[PDB]
Enzyme design. Structure first.
Site, PDB file in Angstrom:
ATOM      1  CG  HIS A 165      51.441  32.832  37.775  1.00 52.82           C
ATOM      2  ND1 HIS A 165      51.987  33.625  38.762  1.00 52.82           N
ATOM      3  CD2 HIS A 165      50.523  33.600  37.137  1.00 52.82           C
ATOM      4  CE1 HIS A 165      51.418  34.818  38.727  1.00 52.82           C
ATOM      5  NE2 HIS A 165      50.515  34.826  37.760  1.00 52.82           N
ATOM      6  CG  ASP A 189      55.086  31.681  39.534  1.00 47.51           C
ATOM      7  OD1 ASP A 189      55.736  32.354  38.709  1.00 47.51           O
ATOM      8  OD2 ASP A 189      54.034  32.066  40.076  1.00 47.51           O
ATOM      9  CG  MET A 242      44.137  32.038  44.050  1.00 43.09           C
ATOM     10  SD  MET A 242      45.600  32.366  43.006  1.00 43.09           S
ATOM     11  CE  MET A 242      46.152  33.895  43.778  1.00 43.09           C
ATOM     12  CE  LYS A 294      48.614  46.205  35.931  1.00 47.22           C
ATOM     13  NZ  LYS A 294      49.936  45.534  35.697  1.00 47.22           N
ATOM     14  CD  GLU A 318      47.451  43.860  42.324  1.00 45.24           C
ATOM     15  OE1 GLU A 318      48.328  44.681  42.020  1.00 45.24           O
ATOM     16  OE2 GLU A 318      47.498  42.667  41.989  1.00 45.24           O
ATOM     17  CG  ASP A 376      45.660  39.604  44.360  1.00 41.17           C
ATOM     18  OD1 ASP A 376      45.408  38.578  45.020  1.00 41.17           O
ATOM     19  OD2 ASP A 376      46.005  39.577  43.174  1.00 41.17           O
ATOM     20  CG  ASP A 395      50.683  46.879  39.104  1.00 42.08           C
ATOM     21  OD1 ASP A 395      50.040  47.247  40.103  1.00 42.08           O
ATOM     22  OD2 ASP A 395      50.814  45.661  38.811  1.00 42.08           O
ATOM     23  CG  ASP A 454      52.498  44.813  42.062  1.00 37.46           C
ATOM     24  OD1 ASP A 454      51.338  45.298  42.047  1.00 37.46           O
ATOM     25  OD2 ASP A 454      52.854  43.920  41.266  1.00 37.46           O
ATOM     26  CG  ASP A 493      50.110  40.294  42.982  1.00 38.86           C
ATOM     27  OD1 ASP A 493      51.345  40.189  42.890  1.00 38.86           O
ATOM     28  OD2 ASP A 493      49.363  40.360  41.971  1.00 38.86           O
TER      29      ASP A 493
HETATM   30 MG   LIG Z   1      47.306  40.655  41.454  1.00 43.28          MG
HETATM   31 MG   LIG Z   2      49.667  44.907  40.467  1.00 41.56          MG
END
Ligand SMILES: [Mg+2]
Ligand SMILES: [Mg+2]
Ligand SMILES: [Mg+2]
Ligand SMILES: [Mg+2]
Ligand SMILES: [Mg+2]
Ligand SMILES: [Mg+2]
Ligand SMILES: [Mg+2]
Ligand SMILES: [Mg+2]
Lengths: 386, 386, 386, 386
Positions: free
Chosen positions: D53, D56, D87, D182, D216, D244, D254, D256, D286
């Protein structure tokens, strides 16, 4: 219309209206509230009292002198407003030291620290007049299978609650414990994930009479369970010591919406049950004003919690008082559900040919239950369409 | 490779391989199986025994003479094959008379009939050598809030199980009861919806030592719960009397896939726990061969149930025996989780300045748990990548 | 109060009030209804019309002469009552031949039969005046990963819908297709599982203008999705050809409760959207009267579907007409959401220093959205507390 | 064994291994990582590249001179290691200004700022060589029904993506957009909640060829959907621009988790599909290393992501290459699924009496699909039991 008074026993956590709006993907949207201001504003809205974690009231790491200053200021706001503190709890989840739990951390020194931190706040709770001490083990759990032997962890959890019971007994304190279940978040799975698991665990403690549950609307709904049903089992066991009210839209992250949002019909049936059963404890709101809101929206969302409870109370009372509903309840045989199946005893049942050999199963099966007419009367009452 | 023997104690319900494939949207795809043929074919696959509902073995409404014929034929198949009958249960859900439940039907005459139907099959179970009698209250529940007062229904459920316990006690039978929880389906919400709710209920029965749980993999996963965790609590309470194994893909209708399908890692951690804890009872499969299958696929799916258990047993044993894993377990402090938090007692804890006043919270918080390395060792073992 | 008239355009499937109560764990609790009686009773309740699967009206396997008899009797009931038939559909899920699907069965001969069975009923639908032909692919899917190559299955699904479009085009029929999504049940996963997947698929058909969606309340809620949001996307794309209304309590088996049961607030926001957007099609109920009910409860549950729609219509209209609500909508900037972000174009945006270089992000971030006050006004209106 | 090389095209976000462990109930457990150190450590593990991002890489609010310093240091680490940046994406969710969204905020000035912030980072992405620009609208949505008119919000979302497409077209950039769906979190419901909704939306954009999806694993599983099925539809539409990879245990917050954790069998079927279809893009992770971990556990969890992909790749390849599996695929008629249903055309189908009038439905229905044997071969291959 629908204005709360302190006799309605509505309470709020300091951390609820004080939530700054930090979520896993975003920074705070509101500044921090002074606990004294929260007490004053909640009193003006008609609340009965407030609750706190130790770390809400006394910032972590405070010196003993700073600690007395924070308590004294708080006690003065309570005296000025007439607010009560019926419940307190321990923060065993925010600090990094608790990243694998408090009472069931794998590290033994962490578990001992967790107990000492809890004991210090039990003393403060008693000083401020709290009747119930809540334990939410939000970090007790695991993200992976090998990280936590659950039988050993339950041994450690029983050890911690037994020691707390020995402490309050030895001090002569008149306070009781309530365990708050949650199925997940922030751990992948949390130990004692539902009201049922907490009730079963309590029966293995040394002094089970000192412990009950503090169920939360949204937490049971995170497992897709019927919250009124779970509350009924807690009442049936005599263990509903406290309750947390909020709203939740199904199986997802813990939303903590204001009470009445989320599953509205479940809120109706919950209020019906609490009032019918004569639950006497606080109506406590553990909710978060959405981070979209400024402070005016914070207080509007807190007021809505109380308003929605009072509207639902009125509608449930009208439902139960309606003669047409009482007749529908008899038509669906709710009266027969309350009568003993076999007060005549086992041997009479075995000898009763009308119970088996001569029972007309086809005639009994053809009887309609009339539940849909009853449920539409309940809908009409909830919506004010009668 | 991975061939079952009757010493592995694998069992199957008659209704599992016998499922004709009728679902709520479609008609049967397979003809009915004679119970005698199912016993023979399961024996050839390496199974230890079978289980039954009363109505699986003796069609509903049979005369006493027809009933003895069905039992005699069944007993002969058991003698010819060496198969055992370790568990039996009652069908209190198929017949329309049970549309509002059995033990907790609003109609009192239905509740009395339900008890008589159960008692008659307990006698048959004992005759055939069953050690466990399962109760799945699949119709005990509601689709709407006013249809069922849950406190009254729990009174009726306690009344029924107490009467059953008085019956087996008075007859001198050596059989125990196991309650099977399910959260929903076919009712909108079912009473005692999870292992925890069932364990808590048992502690209010008159003779709690006679009752345990029969958890099913897919049922706890229908509430999004961790099935190995729930089994660990049941073992911790001493109440795992029986277990139903199958597979389920998340929160949806009850799929009853063959064991090992669904959540594969949860199956691994379940087998690890059962074997580590030394669970001695039957490994029972309550599954449905998909209605896409002919009879060759039925037997292939039943064989796969047993194969997958034996593969996972091997991988979990290799995991626990690996010295690198034992060292990782110490690195994540699983050894410290098993030690008492405060065997020195409450007063020593209160006086221990290393537990609070002089505890370095920042040093403790900085310690990594090393759980991800441990979980990747578990993955490598499950997949045979070491 | 709240009495339906045929101008309200309420419709019901023959299979809804005609559901005999057979579920995966139990036998039928009600006898079969003659389609003619259902038409008469629905007309007396105020319904506008009925819908049918081919196999609801003409039993599977009927001879051509039996078929004309069934249609003639049905057409006479429609003439006698004034009821309309606005929608029809094909049963491609009950018969065992469809156990792996219809349009996407692995067996090519089954896919050809599925198309011929559909085409024959399109002719009948046109004869009876239907404007919309619904396709619910309830058997298109899989329980296991290797059983269905989904890219090939989507090729086969596109092939089938393209052929149907060529057929109606070549016949000059004025009928359009609507695809009904469902995420699961009776297959473990169903192809095109949500409104979004169906909308995306339609855009790859040869004649996309002939196809839209038929979303169902409970089906999107089986994936935990927001049904009003999905309907808004369907309306935005111009593809809401039909809609199925019912109720569902969260993520579990497809309950098909009467409309207004389940998620009541979602029902409120759905009615608000349909009426605000001026949706002109039928308000169709795809629901099942619970098998606890006799025929009196069947008709009570059908009446409740219509009653609840009309009550919610009144409350949503009062909400939108309230000047205090219109002012709250402006306070939450719903007016600004409707204005273009950059009607001045890309280059003007890039040169606008007030959009970046000189934008006060802290002042903008401090603005409260006032959403909680707006949502409590919506609650008060729904409950009739203003 | 199973060692990654940069030719495997494994990529990681800076925010993944850089996650400090702050969650909604707890403070950070790890210090911040310098992006330069993350690039170096990922290169040593065998990664191909990194993603970012804007915020980031360049802390929010940086001056133009500070900005060039951050980029120059980053570019030097890329030159020193050989890592690529395939990306990039925009942070439109952390800052309080985005509390009601970015592209669909009710406030018009916020929507204009969101577009300018995105455009500035597209320039940087192109400079660093990115081929794909991801958009995750994590704040686009609502907690309450009246807060967001979804048709207006979709107009605003289409307006924003159209303007971005006009920008890249006018600049001559060779970059494409991928929308990341999402269903919820951090908003109560998020717009475009699944792969299907995103695919349908893309077809209404002015230049649809510039836009695809970035699905994702965990996000589709948050709605209980089959992730391999959704990926197959994206591939069928030609829209899988990026992906992802991570793990998720069912319907909850979520998680992850590292890839391979969560639903292991779904991971197997996903790798099988990506490799069979010849997906050429990055395998991007991710994920978040659990906050229980120190930095050694961070790198162990990142390595496990890649290891698990390579093990599953091997097992899926062995599955498809096994002659016994190829024969099972023919036995379940996967070959027939790939053949056209009616290449002979509509009129030939209508005249084909073997497709309807003379079709033996009972013979076709009796054919078993043999799916359970096929799925047990897949299990045996996944587990290395052949
Ligand atoms: Mg993602
Ligand atoms: Mg996620
Ligand atoms: Mg909560
Ligand atoms: Mg709480
Ligand atoms: Mg089951
Ligand atoms: Mg079972
Ligand atoms: Mg449905
Ligand atoms: Mg439908």
């Amino acid at each position: 219309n629908y204005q709360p008074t302190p006799e309605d026993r509505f309470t709020f956590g300091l951390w609820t209206v004080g939530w700054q709006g930090r979520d896993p993907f975003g920074d705070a949207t509101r500044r921090a509230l002074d606990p004294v201001e929260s007490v004053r504003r909640l009193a003006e809205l008609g609340a009965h009292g407030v609750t706190f974690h130790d770390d809400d009231l006394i910032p972590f790491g405070s010196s003993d002198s700073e600690r007395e200053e924070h308590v004294k200021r708080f006690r003065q706001a309570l005296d000025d407003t007439g607010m009560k503190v019926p419940m307190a709890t321990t923060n065993l989840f925010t600090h990094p030291v608790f990243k694998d739990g408090g009472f069931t951390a794998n590290d033994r020194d962490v578990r001992r620290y967790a107990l000492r931190k809890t004991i210090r706040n039990i003393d403060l709770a008693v000083e401020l007049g709290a009747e119930t001490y809540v334990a939410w083990g939000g970090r007790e759990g695991a993200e992976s299978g090998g990280a936590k032997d659950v039988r050993d962890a339950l041994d450690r959890m029983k050890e911690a609650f037994d020691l707390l019971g020995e402490y309050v007994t030895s001090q002569g304190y008149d306070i009781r414990f309530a365990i708050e279940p949650k199925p997940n978040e922030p751990r992948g799975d949390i130990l004692l994930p539902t009201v049922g698991h907490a009730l079963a665990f309590i029966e293995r403690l040394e002094r089970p009479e000192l412990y009950g549950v503090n169920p939360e609307v949204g937490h049971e709904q995170m497992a897709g369970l019927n919250f009124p049903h779970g509350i009924a089992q807690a009442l049936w066991a005599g263990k509903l010591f406290h309750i947390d009210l909020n709203g939740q839209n199904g199986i997802k992250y813990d939303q903590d919406l204001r009470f009445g949002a989320g599953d509205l019909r479940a809120a109706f049936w919950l209020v019906d049950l609490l009032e019918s059963a004569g639950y006497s404890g606080p109506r406590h709101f553990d909710f978060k004003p959405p981070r979209t809101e400024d402070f005016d929206g914070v207080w509007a969302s807190a007021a809505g919690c109380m308003r929605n409870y009072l509207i639902l109370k009125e509608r449930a009372a009208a439902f139960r008082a309606d003669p047409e509903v009482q007749e529908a309840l008899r038509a669906s045989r709710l009266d027969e559900l309350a009568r003993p199946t076999a007060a005549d005893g086992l041997q009479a049942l075995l000898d009763d040919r009308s119970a088996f050999e001569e029972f007309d199963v086809d005639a009994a099966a053809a009887r309609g239950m009339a539940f849909e007419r009853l449920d539409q009367l309940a809908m009409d009452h909830l919506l004010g369409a009668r």
